[PDB]
């Protein structure tokens, strides 16, 4: 046995292309649409819960994931690759930051750590790149609200708003017309639901849509009282009912 | 063809070509004969020279006082395998105060060769061995193939033109097995056996190599004028 | 591609057979064993006249009683020589004696097949190992990258080897003197060399029981070349 | 194409061709069988006499694991030995930790997982043997057969090698004609017959019969070789049936 | 075309070795079904013993992973047992480290993560199996979680796996479209097993004897498999109404 | 290998080091030079356990000479002292620490200033106008505290150094066999052959 | 670890990776070495395809291994740094363990050994570099000049050139360099070295570097103007 | 076994070139152009972001210009993720040196170190090289203001003015034409922006498509200041130099 693949599986072609990264981006293109919009007082991330079977309980499959109390993530592409990246991202937030500084990492630095992991799967021996593009939304004290995209290459870019996956080209054009620097969080959620309806074929409701926000601190979700400085997580996943309420004012 | 690039690949008919190619190296090697009675076991080997200025390549290697072998094929592989046998014989003596059974020695050689046929990066051994010995169950003769197959025999031969000697021993089976308590006559039968594999060349004084082990006879190799008696 | 330790359908190791082809391209080296000593000679083969020929070191001392000549990819020989020198000196440390020539040769040849995927390829150089010990007297060995070593009364390796070996077949006898062997190496080197043989493009050496291994001066060899020319003109 | 050049590669069928090629080496080997009896198991194997120079009864093929398990195989003999060496290590570590001798189903999985592991990587070759094995434990007799893929099941009777079809047919008759069961001594006799009948596929050369057995009543649950009078009796019974 | 031999991306962003591992899943030609009751989770699977020389008691694709968790496998038996051994080791290790029994969904995720690694690392091949884990979880209740060679997993109200999975899936879909609940509204597990067998008979269009089926049942604090005689009693009750 | 003194004057650094080496109850040598030139304008004297002193000093020398060749540049005395300190701080938590105390006398050619650094075996570094190791300071510092000026000439520094040695020779129980004195300035390193 | 045998024999007995490494040397800028009676001069070509270059800080082609030995090269620039670093470390390691500086021959033998090692070790490719190593042994006034190449062979030269168009400048050196009477002075040795490069260089401006090494660690690099005076005098004698 | 799938990233071509290095350089030729110009009183770094969007958050974005320490900065051309791996290693090396010698690392020593890391990936390990070219802008008290470049081969050189990325042939010719030795920072700022404006593949050069930085002794008295320009500050300098 032993892993005898100690050589790179991603290499430059004569034209300067890194084939495996391009092909990983193609897998992302086939993936279900997900988007993110940044408001003045929050960030929203959303995607479709494309259920593989009606017998499957799609609530047990979480496409939108909490990374830290103030940082959330969504993806487009290969779901299993995303799941393991979420596991690694949650852990690295502790091992390379919280256990050192006694606080959670700022969004840009956690993104940087996830990006590094994805870059290494593009150069290290005997592995293929991750077949996902991530959208990471978060808040921290000194940088405020932010939204980042991370690609299979490990490259990451900050966005005011963006979309990835199936209908990203049409969705990004839709977001360009609607976005401004004065949007409130509820306005961003409304725009997110409008944008997401265009790429969805079948049922469009709280049970088929997954949506979360980075916004105000939620002391009701903290689980304890007594420490004034601890005010609760800014990440909150919207319920099925909360989504349907906003679909009537759509 | 497409399945002979390494030892880790079966062909569509279930063959291992690298092992078969290693077997081919033995066929190119010089002839060596092995035979035994109930009291003694004998090795006879035709040594090969490079040219008239060169020495004749040694074929027989001593492993212990009661055991040794003759080789045909890649000589360095015989040195590796015989070194392993020397160590195993020695481990048995030092730890258990016990002379290593010839049958157990064969089992150890089989397993060592086998590991080189199932793993990537390595290669099969390119040599065949005839092991003789005298232990607690009497005289023994073994034939080793680098496929891993080890066989206990009354007599045999390996190398180029070995089929002639093997047929002779198959005829003489009932005679040479009965040569008990007469080392010279058993060697004669071995020298007569290896003679059935000669063409153009004959057995000279620096050409012939003989070894013997038995009841009250440590493994000893005869070369030079010590084999002129049998020419 | 294919394994480095792969057997051919004929039962030969590809890489070992290919390294033998590299040795055929090497400069000629000749050895002749006598009862008065063993002579070692080499063709230097300088690629340019500006190359200082005395820096070409193709004959090398292993111990006081063992010398060595090389042919082929001579850079590969350096680690082999280093191992040989270490083995010779280490045995003296462990046993307070000289090491046997055969044992030294066997130790060098143990390195040969230590290649795979250890070093990445066989050695591309052949060695003529000459020496003396009390048990077997004057000896000459030919060490190959296959791990095989033959003892020889006389042997030639390199580009002019088969022509030289045929010549050594006719000339060698068991009563040769040291002086006769010296002239014989010079004669056969002169025969197979491209350029005209002189003291600057050819080198002699010997091993005797009394004086041990010695590389010959260019002045000493020049006299033997002049002695050779005169005796060939004598008939 | 090229899917069959490397072990552990799935073909578009979902097959591992390298394992299937290992089966061809097994099918090329000599016939070996196993029979489950009332309180134990019987193993038998065909040994081809390539030459008169082979010493009779010396080149033993059936192998013991621990003191209660017998193992026989067809195909590449060295591969079988390698598997039995591992089996012996597995049995030793089980007994070391748990005291009790390894149960047969437990032992079967240890071999199974090890053989299956050699289908996971391209850096190793699959086993070129099918192994028939078994013995007696606290829950009674067990007979197993293990393939190159790592696949194994429990058997009433088992056969592999070149004459497996003939042997299987004979085993199926015994199962039908004896629903109540077969005695250990009967199973030895029947094992001899079946190897003799299966030798028609290898009729060019003559052969040597080798039998072993583990039985609660006949061998105290220990693996033993069938020798001397009992072996001759089985040979005579076998020779009588072919004529 | 070495992108088809190892787990690297093809130009279309596909992993062909993963896709071919899915095809190996149906090599056994066996169909399995899983449903949930009020207090239980039932799994049934076809049992085919084609050789008369086989000991039928040893032919099984249902595994007792822990006291609480059962697992049925669709795919070749060597890979099935590989997965079974690992799942047993993981479940035991979990209990030792964290002081409570490993949940069904957590084991499914763990095995799914291991499968994901085989789709990303070149030296390891995917296992050609689909793993359906069942239990009555102490927090979530009756649970069905299924893993595949892509490293995908999800919870199920009910599920089916095999060559004729679509026929069984649609049959189950239609029943739950009528009842409008996420489970079989029945008190006893015996009747939930009867439901499972009945709907497999309807979907496949084949009758079953006691030796043609294999049944696993999960209740609170234990998972167990039924004997042939237990299954016979189940078949008799089905025929008598 | 016990007594090592240092003084930084106006334009140079002066290092004085004892000549004695003792094995058991016998003085083996009375001309030992307990110093190594690290670079043309940097000198290091040393004292501590037998063997470790020279081994450490030569190891430092090799590293600074390596740096000099690689960069074609002489490191500042401050940079060299920091390198040396780190090596000793590293060493104190090793399996077997190097029991070596050093004085580093260098002339900084960039700043045109002499510099004296005192570093003990723990990696305790201080920059001083004058320094010593072990008990040497106990006898000499009261004289240096009294007489020392920062505008002293090299000749005045040598005279103050003579007074320090005389006091050592009077009140120390051990015969250290005099001192070798070396001067480090803009022109490099030289030895005072009559002291 | 990555163990792949990259340097292997071909059917005709060639190691192509080692031979292709020589092709990288052929591409590199020309380097030349000439030893006089009491000195050695190392000349190096600078390709003028790169202007706007900062010549103060750009890596110089001649590198001091110790105070008494220098090394120049032709081939891959990045590869040469690894050999130079190793050589510098070995030089200090020798001074530390043997208490003498390295001889020029010893230093050459070490660098050549590193190059050879990289031709039969797994997972590595050969150095695409040939070197000229020059200097004077400690307490010796005899000039030393050696050459190494990717295969690991080395030898001593009265005069030698490596790199692109080295065939041409070797042609010049073979007819102009007399062994019985080598360049007796520094002037004559530098003049002959500049003349040899002018056969190949193009413009005699910033394209020629000259480094003179004399006994007892006396090493100096000539400036643009000093070299320009040689370039001027050579062509004025040529106009005849 | 595994050999079958090995691309062999560290081999020579028959011509004596390193395949992967050459192909990595081809990749870099499509990256946004980065320019460095050295003046007597400072250094300028100018770089073009690749076809951006209106929804990209520019003021928090960084893809071209990175700080290694207070005295040294780099401009990137190629794979940004590959660059960040090397950048973090360089940042650590600078701090290692500062801890060891208690002096800021000289520019060349940092450059040589990173270039050696790149070199290693071309000679051993069997991994793909880093698809990155750097322009190093820095200051130390030995050589003063310095510009360097390094590429995937691990080769590095010093420059008065230099470009990397797209259209380097055109850019280098324009720089070679207008550059003079007695040039000042404010003049160099103008030259850099004018060169980018002529070589760009975009229709027009605007503030949102640029990253800009200067290293000046225009810090109060004998010390050096790094200035990473803000979006509004890039917009102002574009108007000042008369490009928009
Ligand atoms: Cl996990």
Residues of D annotated as catalytic are 30
The helix/strand/coil state of A156 is strand
CATH of the domain at H86: 3.60.20.10
d(CA H162, CA H149): 8
Answer whether B64's CB lies under 8 Å from C183's CB: no
Spell out the residues 6+ positions from residue F102 whose beta carbon is closer than 8 angstroms to its own. Answer: F44, F45, F46, F47, F57, F84, F118, F119, F133
Containing domain of residue D77, as a range?
1-243
CB contact under 8 A, E154 and A28: no
Terminal C-alpha separation, chain B: 46
Q: What is the 3-state secondary structure (H, E, C) of chain B?
A: CCCCCCCCCCCCCCCCHHHHHHHHHHHHCCCEEEEECCCEEEEEEECCECCCCECECCCEEEEECCEEEEEEECHHHHHHHHHHHHHHHHHHHHHHCCCCCHHHHHHHHHHHHHHCCCECCCCCCCEEEEEEEEECCEEEEEEECCCCCEEEECEEEECCCHHHHHHHHHHHHHHHCCCCCCHHHHHHHHHHHHHHHCCCCCCCCCCEEEEEEECCEEEEEECHHHHHHHC
In degrees rounded to 5, what are phi and psi of residue H16?
A: 90, 30
Where is chain H discontinuous (C–N over 2.5 Å), named by the preceding residue?
none
Q: What is the nearest CA distance from A31 to chain E, expressed in angstroms?
A: 11
Which of A10, A77, A78 to substitute to test the interface with E, most E CBs within 10 Å?
A: A78
Containing domain of residue H163, as a range?
1-244
d(CA D218, CA D5): 49
Q: How far is CA F137 from the centre of its chain?
A: 13
Continuous H helices in chain A: 19-30, 79-93, 99-101, 107-120, 168-178, 185-199, 240-248
Q: Nearest residue on chain D to B154, judged by CA atoms?
A: D53
Q: What is the resolution of this structure in A?
A: 2.4
d(CA G108, CA G88): 12
d(CA H56, CA A161): 8
Where is chain E discontinuous (C–N over 2.5 Å), named by the preceding residue?
none
The DSSP symbol for C98 reads P
How many domains in chain D?
A: 1
| List of domains in chain A | 1-250 (3.60.20.10)
Chain D CB contacts of H1 below 8 Å: 6, 122-123
Lookup result for tokens 């800009």: H212
- Cα-based angle C96, C97, C101 (whole degrees, multiple of 5): 145
Answer whether G123's CB lies under 8 Å from H124's CB: yes
CB atoms within 10 A of CB H94: 20
CB contact under 8 A, C75 and G112: yes
**Cα E114 to middle of ligand 1, angstroms:** 7
Q: What is the nearest CA distance from H4 to chain E, expressed in angstroms?
A: 8
F1-195 has CATH 3.60.20.10 classification: yes
Partnered with residue C150 across adjacent β-strands are C142
Nearest to E68 by CA among E140, E138, E155: E138
Nearest to D17 by CA among D28, D3, D33: D3
The HSE-up count of residue D123 (CA atoms within 13 Å, CB side) is: 14
d(CA C62, CA C83): 9
Quick one: CA dihedral D218, D223, D224, D225, positive or negative? Answer: positive
d(CA G183, CA A29): 72
How many domains in chain C?
A: 1
Quick one: CA dihedral F171, F172, F178, F183, positive or negative? Answer: negative
Partnered with residue C61 across adjacent β-strands are C67
Answer whether F23's CB lies under 8 Å from F76's CB: no
Tokens of residue G50, six digits: 């790169």
d(CA F33, CA F46): 10
Chain A CB contacts of D115 below 8 Å: none
Nearest to G65 by CA among G181, G213, G205: G213
d(CA B61, CA B58): 8
- Roughly what angle, to the nearest 10 degrees, separates helices D184-198 and D164-177? 150
Answer whether F184's CB lies under 8 Å from F37's CB: no
Q: Which residues surround ligand 1, an ion (CB under 5 A)?
A: E 113
- Cα-based angle G77, G83, G88 (whole degrees, multiple of 5): 120
Please tell me the experimental approach by which this structure was elucidated.
X-ray
CATH of the domain at B88: 3.60.20.10
Nearest to A175 by CA among A157, A194, A158: A194
d(CA E92, CA E102): 8
In degrees rounded to 5, what are phi and psi of residue G130?
A: -110, 145
The helix/strand/coil state of C32 is strand
Containing domain of residue E169, as a range?
1-241
Q: If interface means Cβ-Cβ distance under 8 Å, which residues of chain D face chain E? A: 2-3, 6, 8-15, 36, 105, 109, 112-113, 115-116, 119-123, 143, 149-159, 168, 171-172, 175-176
d(CA F102, CA D107): 69
**Chain D stretch 96-135, residues whose beta carbon is closer than 8 A to a beta carbon of chain A:** 117, 120-121, 123-124
d(CA E150, CA H137): 48
The DSSP symbol for C76 reads G
CB contact under 8 A, C152 and B53: yes
The answer to whether G95 contacts chain F (CB < 8 Å) is: yes
Containing domain of residue C215, as a range?
1-235
CATH of the domain at C226: 3.60.20.10
d(CA C2, CA C9): 14
Q: What is the nearest CA distance from B30 to chain C, expressed in angstroms?
A: 14
DSSP string, H107-131: HHHHHHHHHHHHHHHHHBSSPPPP-
CATH of the domain at E14: 3.60.20.10
CATH of the domain at D61: 3.60.20.10
Partner residue opposite B8 with nearest CB, options D26, D52, D125:
D125
CB contact under 8 A, E154 and A56: yes
Spell out the residues 6+ positions from residue A185 whose beta carbon is closer than 8 angstroms to its own. Answer: A39, A40, A41, A42, A44, A213, A215
The CATH architecture assigned to G1-240 reads: 4-Layer Sandwich (3.60)
d(CA A195, CA A209): 12
């Amino acid at each position: 046995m032993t892993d005898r693949y100690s050589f790179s599986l991603t290499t430059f072609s004569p034209s300067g292309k890194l084939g495996q990264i391009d092909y990983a981006l193609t897998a992302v293109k086939q993936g279900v649409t997900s988007l993110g919009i940044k408001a003045t007082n929050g960030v929203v991330i959303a995607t479709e819960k494309k259920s593989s079977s009606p017998l499957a309980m799609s609530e047990t499959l979480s496409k939108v994931s909490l990374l830290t109390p103030d940082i959330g993530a969504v993806y487009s592409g290969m779901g299993p690759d995303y799941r393991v990246l979420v596991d690694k991202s949650r852990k690295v937030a502790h091992t390379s930051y919280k256990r050192i500084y006694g606080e959670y990492p700022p969004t840009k630095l956690l993104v940087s750590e996830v990006a590094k992991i994805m870059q290494e799967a593009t150069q290290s021996g005997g592995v293929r790149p991750f077949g996902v593009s991530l959208l990471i939304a978060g808040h921290d004290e000194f940088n405020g609200f932010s939204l980042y995209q991370v690609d299979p290459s490990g490259s990451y870019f900050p966005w005011k708003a963006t979309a990835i996956g199936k209908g990203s080209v049409a969705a990004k054009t839709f977001l360009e017309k609607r976005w401004n620097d004065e949007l409130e969080l509820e306005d961003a959620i409304h725009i997110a639901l409008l944008t997401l309806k265009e790429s969805v074929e079948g049922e469009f409701n709280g049970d088929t849509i997954e949506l979360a926000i980075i916004g105000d601190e939620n002391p009701d979700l903290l689980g304890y009282t007594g420490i004034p400085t601890d005010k609760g997580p800014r990440f909150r996943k919207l319920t099925s009912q909360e989504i349907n309420d906003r679909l009537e004012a759509l | 063809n497409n399945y002979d690039g390494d030892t880790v690949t079966f062909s569509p008919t279930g063959r291992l070509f690298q092992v078969e190619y290693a077997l081919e190296a033995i066929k190119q090697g010089s002839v060596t004969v092995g035979l035994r009675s109930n009291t003694h076991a004998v090795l006879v080997a035709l040594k090969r020279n490079a040219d008239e200025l060169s020495s004749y390549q040694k074929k027989i290697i001593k492993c212990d006082e009661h055991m040794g072998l003759s080789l045909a094929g890649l000589a360095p592989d015989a040195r590796v395998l015989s070194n392993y046998l020397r160590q195993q014989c020695n481990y048995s003596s030092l730890v258990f105060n016990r002379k290593l059974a010839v049958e157990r020695a064969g089992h150890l050689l089989c397993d060592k060769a086998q590991k080189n046929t199932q793993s990537y990066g390595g290669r099969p051994y390119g040599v065949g061995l005839l092991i003789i010995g005298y232990d607690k169950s009497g005289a023994h003769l073994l034939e080793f193939q680098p496929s891993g197959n080890v066989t206990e025999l009354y007599g045999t031969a390996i190398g180029a033109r070995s089929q002639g000697a093997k047929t002779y021993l198959e005829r003489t089976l009932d005679t040479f097995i009965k040569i008990d308590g007469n080392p010279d006559e058993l060697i004669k039968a071995g020298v007569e056996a290896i003679s059935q594999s000669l063409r153009d060349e004959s057995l000279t004084v620096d050409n012939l190599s003989i070894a013997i082990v038995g009841k009250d006879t440590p493994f000893t190799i005869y070369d030079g004028e010590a084999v002129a008696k049998y020419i | 591609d294919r394994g480095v330790s792969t057997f051919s359908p004929e039962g030969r190791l590809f890489q070992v057979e290919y390294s033998l082809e590299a040795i055929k391209l090497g400069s000629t080296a000749i050895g002749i064993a006598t009862k008065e000593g063993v002579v070692l000679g080499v063709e230097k083969r300088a690629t340019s006249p500006l190359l200082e020929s005395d820096s070409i070191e193709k004959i090398v001392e292993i111990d006081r009683h063992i010398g060595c000549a090389m042919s082929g990819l001579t850079a590969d020989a350096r680690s082999m020589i280093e191992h040989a020198r270490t083995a010779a000196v280490t045995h003296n440390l462990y046993y307070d004696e000289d090491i046997n020539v055969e044992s030294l040769t066997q130790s060098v040849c143990d390195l040969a097949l230590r290649f795979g995927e250890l070093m990445s390829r066989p050695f591309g150089v052949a060695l003529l190992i000459a020496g003396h010990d009390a048990d077997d007297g004057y000896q000459l060995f030919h060490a190959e990258p296959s791990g095989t070593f033959y003892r020889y009364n006389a042997k030639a390796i390199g580009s002019g080897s088969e022509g030289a070996q045929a010549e050594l077949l006719n000339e060698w006898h068991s009563s040769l003197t040291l002086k006769e062997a010296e002239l014989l190496v010079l004669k056969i080197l002169k025969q197979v060399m491209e350029e005209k043989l002189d003291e600057n493009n050819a080198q002699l050496s010997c091993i005797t029981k009394q004086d041990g291994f010695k590389i010959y001066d260019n002045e000493k060899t020049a006299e033997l070349i002049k002695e050779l020319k005169e005796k060939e003109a004598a008939e | 194409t090229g899917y069959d050049l490397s072990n552990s590669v799935f073909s578009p069928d979902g097959r591992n061709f390298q394992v299937e090629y290992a089966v061809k080496a097994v099918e090329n080997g000599t016939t070996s069988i196993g029979i489950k009896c009332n309180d134990g198991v019987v193993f038998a194997v065909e040994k081809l006499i390539t030459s008169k120079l082979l010493v009779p009864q010396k080149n033993v093929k059936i192998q013991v694991v621990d003191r209660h398990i017998g193992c026989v195989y067809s195909g590449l003999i060295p591969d079988g030995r390698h598997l039995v060496n591992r089996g012996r290590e597995e049995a030793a570590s089980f007994k070391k930790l748990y005291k009790t001798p390894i149960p047969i189903p437990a032992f079967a999985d240890r071999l199974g997982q090890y053989v299956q592991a050699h289908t996971l990587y391209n850096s190793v070759r699959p086993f070129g043997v099918s192994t028939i094995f078994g013995g007696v434990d606290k829950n009674g007799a067990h007979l197993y057969m293990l393939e190159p893929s790592g696949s194994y099941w429990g058997y009433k009777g088992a056969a592999t090698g070149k004459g497996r079809q003939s042997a299987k047919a004979e085993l199926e008759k015994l199962v039908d004609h004896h629903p109540e069961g077969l005695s250990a001594r009967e199973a030895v006799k029947q094992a001899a017959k079946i190897i003799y009948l299966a030798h028609e596929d290898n009729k060019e050369k003559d052969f040597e019969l080798e039998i072993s057995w583990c039985s609660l009543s006949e061998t105290n649950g220990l693996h033993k070789f069938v020798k001397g009078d009992l072996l001759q009796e089985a040979i005579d019974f076998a020779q009588k049936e072919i004529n | 075309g070495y992108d088809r031999h190892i787990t690297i991306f093809s130009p279309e962003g596909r992993l062909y070795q993963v896709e071919y591992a899915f095809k190996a899943t149906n090599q056994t030609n066996i169909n399995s079904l899983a449903v949930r009751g009020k207090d239980c989770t039932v799994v049934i699977s076809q049992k085919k013993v084609p050789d008369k020389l086989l000991d039928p008691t040893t032919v099984s694709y249902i595994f007792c992973i822990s006291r609480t968790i059962g697992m049925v496998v669709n795919g070749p038996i060597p890979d099935a047992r590989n997965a079974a051994l690992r799942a047993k080791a993981e479940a035991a290790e979990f209990r030792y480290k964290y002081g409570y029994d490993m949940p069904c969904d957590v084991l499914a995720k763990r095995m799914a993560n291991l499968s994901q690694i085989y789709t990303q690392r070149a030296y390891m091949r995917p296992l050609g199996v689909i793993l359906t884990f069942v239990s009555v979880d102490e927090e979530l209740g009756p649970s069905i979680y299924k893993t595949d060679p892509a490293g995908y997993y999800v919870g199920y109200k009910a599920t089916a796996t095999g060559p004729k999975q679509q026929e069984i899936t649609t049959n189950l879909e239609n029943h739950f479209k009528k009842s409008k609940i996420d489970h079989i509204n029945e008190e006893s597990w015996e009747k939930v097993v009867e439901f499972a067998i009945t709907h497999m008979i309807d979907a496949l269009g084949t009758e079953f004897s006691k030796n043609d089926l294999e049944v696993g049942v999960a209740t609170k604090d234990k998972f167990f498999t039924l004997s042939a005689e237990n299954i016979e009693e189940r078949l008799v009750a089905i025929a008598e109404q | 290998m016990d007594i090592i003194l240092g003084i930084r004057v106006q334009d140079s650094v002066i290092l004085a080091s004892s000549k004695a080496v003792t094995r058991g109850i016998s003085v083996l040598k009375d001309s030992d030079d307990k110093t190594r030139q690290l670079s043309p304008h940097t000198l290091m004297s040393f004292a501590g356990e037998a063997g470790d002193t020279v081994q450490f000093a030569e190891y430092i020398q090799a590293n600074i000479q390596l740096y000099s060749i690689r960069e074609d540049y002489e490191l500042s005395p401050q940079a060299v002292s920091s390198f040396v300190r780190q090596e000793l701080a590293k060493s104190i938590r090793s399996r077997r620490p190097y029991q070596v105390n050093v004085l580093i006398g260098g002339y900084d050619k960039k700043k045109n200033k002499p510099e004296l650094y005192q570093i003990d075996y723990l990696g305790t570094k201080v920059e001083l106008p004058y320094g010593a190791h072990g008990y040497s300071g106990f006898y000499t510092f009261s004289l240096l505290d009294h007489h020392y000026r920062p505008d002293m000439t090299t000749e005045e520094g040598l005279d103050l150094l003579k007074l320090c040695v005389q006091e050592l020779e009077k009140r120390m129980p051990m015969d250290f066999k005099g001192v070798i004195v070396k001067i480090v300035d803009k022109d490099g390193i030289r030895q005072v052959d009559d002291f | 670890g990555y163990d792949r045998a990259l340097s292997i024999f071909s059917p005709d007995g060639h190691i192509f990776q080692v031979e292709y490494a020589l092709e990288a040397v052929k591409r590199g800028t020309c380097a030349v070495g000439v030893k006089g009676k009491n000195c050695v001069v190392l000349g190096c070509e600078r390709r003028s395809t790169l202007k706007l270059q900062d010549t103060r800080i750009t890596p110089s082609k001649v590198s001091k291994i110790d105070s008494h030995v220098v090394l120049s090269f032709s081939g891959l620039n990045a590869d040469s740094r690894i050999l130079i670093e190793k050589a510098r470390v070995e030089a200090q390691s020798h001074r530390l363990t043997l208490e003498d500086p390295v001889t020029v021959e010893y230093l050459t033998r070490y660098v050549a050994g590193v190059q050879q090692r990289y031709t039969q070790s797994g997972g590595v490719r050969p150095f695409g570099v040939s070197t000229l190593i020059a200097g004077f042994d400690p307490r010796d006034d005899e000039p030393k000049l050696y050459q190494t190449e990717p295969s690991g062979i080395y030898s001593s030269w009265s005069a030698q050139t490596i790199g692109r168009n080295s065939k041409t400048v070797r042609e010049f050196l073979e007819k102009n360099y007399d062994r019985k009477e080598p360049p007796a002075t520094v002037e004559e040795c530098v003049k002959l070295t500049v003349r040899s490069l002018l056969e190949v260089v193009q413009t005699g401006a910033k394209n020629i570097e000259i480094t003179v090494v004399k006994p007892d660690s006396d090493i100096v690099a000539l400036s643009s103007e000093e070299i320009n005076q040689y370039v001027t005098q050579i062509e004025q004698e040529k106009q005849e | 076994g595994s050999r079958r799938y090995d691309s062999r990233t560290t081999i020579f071509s028959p011509e004596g070139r390193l395949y992967q290095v050459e192909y990595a350089l081809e990749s870099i030729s499509h990256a946004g152009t980065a320019i460095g110009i050295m003046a007597s009183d400072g250094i300028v770094l100018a770089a073009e972001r690749k076809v951006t969007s209106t929804l990209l958050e520019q003021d928090t974005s960084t893809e071209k210009l990175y700080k290694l320490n207070d005295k040294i900065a780099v401009a990137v051309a190629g794979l940004t993720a590959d660059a960040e791996i090397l950048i973090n290693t360089a940042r650590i090396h600078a701090q290692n040196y500062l801890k060891t010698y208690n002096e800021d690392i000289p520019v060349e020593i940092l450059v040589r170190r990173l270039s050696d890391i790149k070199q290693g990936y071309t000679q051993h390990g069997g991994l793909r090289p880093f698809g990155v070219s750097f322009i190093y802008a820095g200051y130390d008290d030995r050589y003063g203001y310095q510009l360097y470049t390094s590429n995937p081969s691990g080769n590095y050189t010093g420059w008065k003015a230099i470009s990397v990325g797209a259209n380097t042939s055109a850019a280098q010719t324009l720089l070679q034409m207008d550059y003079k030795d007695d040039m000042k920072v404010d003049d160099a700022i103008e030259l850099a922006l004018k060169t980018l404006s002529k070589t760009t593949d975009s229709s027009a050069l605007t503030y949102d498509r640029l990253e800009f930085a200067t290293i000046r002794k225009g810090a109060n008295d004998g010390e050096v200041y790094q200035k990473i320009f803000k979006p509004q500050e890039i917009k102002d300098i574009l108007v000042k130099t008369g490009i928009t």
